[PDB]
Design a protein around this ligand. Structure first.
Ligand SMILES: [Mg+2]
Ligand SMILES: [Mg+2]
Ligand SMILES: [Mg+2]
Length: 628
RNA sequence: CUUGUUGUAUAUAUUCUUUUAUAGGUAUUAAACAACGGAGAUGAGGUGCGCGU
DNA sequence: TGTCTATTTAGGA
DNA sequence: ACGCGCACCTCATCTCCTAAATAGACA
């Protein structure tokens, strides 16, 4: 289907950040009006006004005065049962005839058709569509029993209606036939919807009225669609623009209709659309009408779209393999037994076991676990327990981590020497992934420390915390996000996350290409033990009630007793030898860090996007990914 | 225009950074592999801090 | 006026 | 754990990536 390619402009282009800011301001004004009138005006009033003030006989007014829409609320313009172009034209010409979004023109004098009607307004409408089309009135799924209340009958009714947009009586029958005509249908499941189809006929007025009342209910707490302040992107639809190859070059020139003249924007070339390739001809033959101007690191990029589908060359089925996700010793664990059958596979656990320096530090249990993994096809020896030794310098695994790192980097040097590029990049990315995750943890912890220090030195005082209007104004005037300190830390975090994402992509590509280049025709990615952080001191005092309680006899939940028996909390006593404050000892303050270190790699290494990367690699590869 | 973005060097120098220290910044040298459907919005989860239980 | 750019309208019955 | 705020991050879901005809601008 559709595809994208991004180009970088070469030289100085009139499209600056001010053009994009103007675009976004118009977007937000239009969205503000649309939000504030989602129910205050009906479609018939709009169509009647357009008929009166212009007197035109067009379908977008004949479709706004018919019996269906002449009195329904404006938000039905955004639903899938109303013609798209009629909704667009009716809404746009209403807004244009009344100057609702305040359009006073644009800086570059780009044609209003490409900037306003098929630009920011087009995005506003396409955005308000997804809000209302996914709009799931408050509802859940429950098993329908014979002795179930009227709500249970009605909830599963409307729940399936939303999932299938069925309105007429006949459409209910069609969904009943949807599964029955399919081989081996579930008899009980379809009857569950047949019963509600029967219920649909009894009191349809109550059903439709309640569904629309709920829809109106979920459209007054909606604050509208908002384009953020960090976007730096504008989209223009232009029917007639020209993209041309340069003369004696690899780049392109974009001829953009701009102030009634053709402005030429020079673009660099991509090795992605490169000279003499089929993708180049496809791009230059079938490119779409949407142009996206985006600024990234103070550089202007231009995104075009086109149609290109490659011809998948199949291969004979050989094997199917299961990939499992783990978090303890290695990320990727296979069900195969490593017999050196795989070509281009380096077994790093089996390599770490051939060094006396490493296994001499191992116990009998640890050595047994490592030998278990060495016989298994595994990838990415991310060892979370040893990795924390780089942060905690007093960890009992501090020397194991050093030997692991030294041996892994020695293997990296050896692979670089022997010109084994694929395995070399794999090992480099593994090492860099470990280092970069330690860096990300350090940066995130510094972010937390800096936020805490800023919000304690700021000293918020709230007269009433029940609602925003009663709290301190500096909560919103001067956040920590707007402090210079945060932007530096957030930029560093973004850079580290970028490196982490790249290294994980490299490892995933390595795994996929080993299994592809060995005959495996499916890699069935077989589809989370959060360590618990010690309860905080404020939780220890104001929540677990360890304040003014006797130190000798502590009335608390047994988990707190076990934590106190460990040297985690140091308690500060008073004249009565009872607790008035507490702190973290070294042991507890580092237990908290260990728990955070283990939990953050769950949410930072994108382990719920691994399947996505394998799918994308299967979009152009000899292997397929079967979800388990 | 040996041309876009991102990853991959435990490279040379540094009176740089503990807010990326087995890594980065500032300047160089050195590449060859690889991935590349984006933009926008909404919703749901999780998380940190602060103020109250 | 001729040519090139911008604006309009698109239905379901 | 709960509430109110301020943020941050990862996921899921959806829309949209047209085209002919007419009107207008200006030499
Ligand atoms: Mg980087
Ligand atoms: Mg590169
Ligand atoms: Mg150095």
């Amino acid at each position: 289907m559709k595809k994208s390619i991004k180009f970088k402009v070469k030289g100085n282009c009139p499209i600056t950040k001010d053009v994009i800011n103007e675009y976004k301001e118009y977007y937000n004004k239009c969205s503000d009006w649309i939000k504030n009138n989602l129910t205050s005006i009906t479609i018939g009033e709009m169509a009647k006004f357009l008929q009166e003030t212009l007197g035109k006989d067009v379908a977008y007014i004949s479709m706004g005065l018919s019996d269906e829409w002449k009195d329904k609320p404006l938000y039905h313009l955004f639903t899938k049962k109303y013609h798209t172009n009629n909704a667009d034209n009716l809404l746009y010409y209403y807004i244009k005839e009344k100057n609702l979004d305040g359009y006073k023109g644009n800086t570059l004098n780009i044609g209003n058709t490409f900037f306003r009607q098929f630009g920011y307004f087009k995005l506003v409408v396409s955005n308000y569509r997804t809000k209302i089309r996914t709009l799931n009135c408050e509802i859940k799924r429950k098993k329908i029993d014979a002795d179930s209340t009227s709500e249970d009958i009605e909830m599963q009714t409307m729940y399936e209606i939303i999932k299938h947009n069925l309105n007429k009586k006949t459409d209910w029958d069609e969904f009943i036939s949807y599964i029955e005509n399919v081989e081996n249908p579930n008899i009980d499941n379809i009857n569950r919807y047949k019963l509600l189809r029967k219920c649909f006929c009894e009191n349809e007025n109550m059903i439709k009225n309640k569904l629309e009342l709920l829809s109106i209910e979920q459209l007054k707490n909606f604050g509208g669609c908002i384009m953020k302040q960090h976007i730096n992107s504008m989209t223009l639809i232009i029917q007639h623009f020209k993209i041309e190859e340069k003369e004696n070059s690899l780049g392109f020139i974009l001829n953009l209709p701009l102030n009634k003249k053709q402005y030429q924007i020079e673009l660099w070339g991509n090795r992605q659309v490169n000279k003499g390739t089929k993708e180049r001809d496809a791009f230059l033959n079938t490119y779409g009408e949407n142009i996206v101007f985006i600024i990234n690191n103070d550089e202007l990029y231009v995104v075009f779209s086109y149609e290109y589908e490659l011809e998948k060359e199949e291969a004979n089925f050989v094997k199917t393999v299961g990939l499992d996700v783990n978090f303890k010793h290695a990320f990727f664990v296979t069900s195969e037994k490593d017999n050196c059958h795989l070509d281009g596979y380096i077994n790093l656990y089996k390599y770490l076991l051939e060094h006396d320096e490493f296994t001499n530090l191992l116990t009998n249990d640890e050595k047994k676990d490592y030998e278990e993994l060495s016989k298994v096809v595994t990838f990415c020896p991310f060892e979370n327990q040893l990795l924390f030794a780089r942060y905690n310098k007093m960890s009992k695994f501090c020397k194991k981590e050093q030997v692991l790192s030294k041996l892994l980097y020695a293997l990296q040097k050896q692979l670089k020497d022997e010109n084994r590029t694929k395995e070399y990049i794999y090992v480099s990315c593994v090492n860099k992934l470990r280092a970069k995750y330690v860096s990300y943890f350090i940066l995130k912890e510094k972010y937390y420390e800096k936020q805490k220090e800023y919000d304690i030195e700021m000293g918020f005082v709230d007269d009433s915390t029940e609602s925003k209007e009663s709290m301190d104004k500096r909560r919103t005037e001067f956040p920590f996000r707007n402090t210079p300190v945060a932007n530096e830390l957030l930029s560093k975090l973004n850079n580290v996350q970028q490196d982490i994402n790249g290294c994980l992509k490299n490892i995933i590509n390595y795994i996929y290409k080993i299994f592809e280049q060995n005959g495996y025709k499916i890699v069935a990615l077989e589809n989370f033990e959060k360590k618990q952080v010690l309860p905080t001191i404020k939780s220890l005092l104001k929540y677990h009630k360890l304040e003014n309680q006797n130190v000798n006899d502590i009335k608390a939940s047994d988990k707190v007793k076990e934590y106190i028996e460990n040297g985690y909390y140091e308690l500060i006593t008073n004249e009565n030898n009872e607790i008035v404050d507490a702190k973290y000892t070294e042991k507890g303050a580092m237990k908290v860090k260990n728990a955070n270190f283990f939990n953050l790699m769950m949410k930072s290494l994108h382990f719920a996007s691994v399947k996505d990367e394998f799918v994308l690699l299967s979009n152009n590869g000899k292997t397929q990914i079967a979800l388990v």
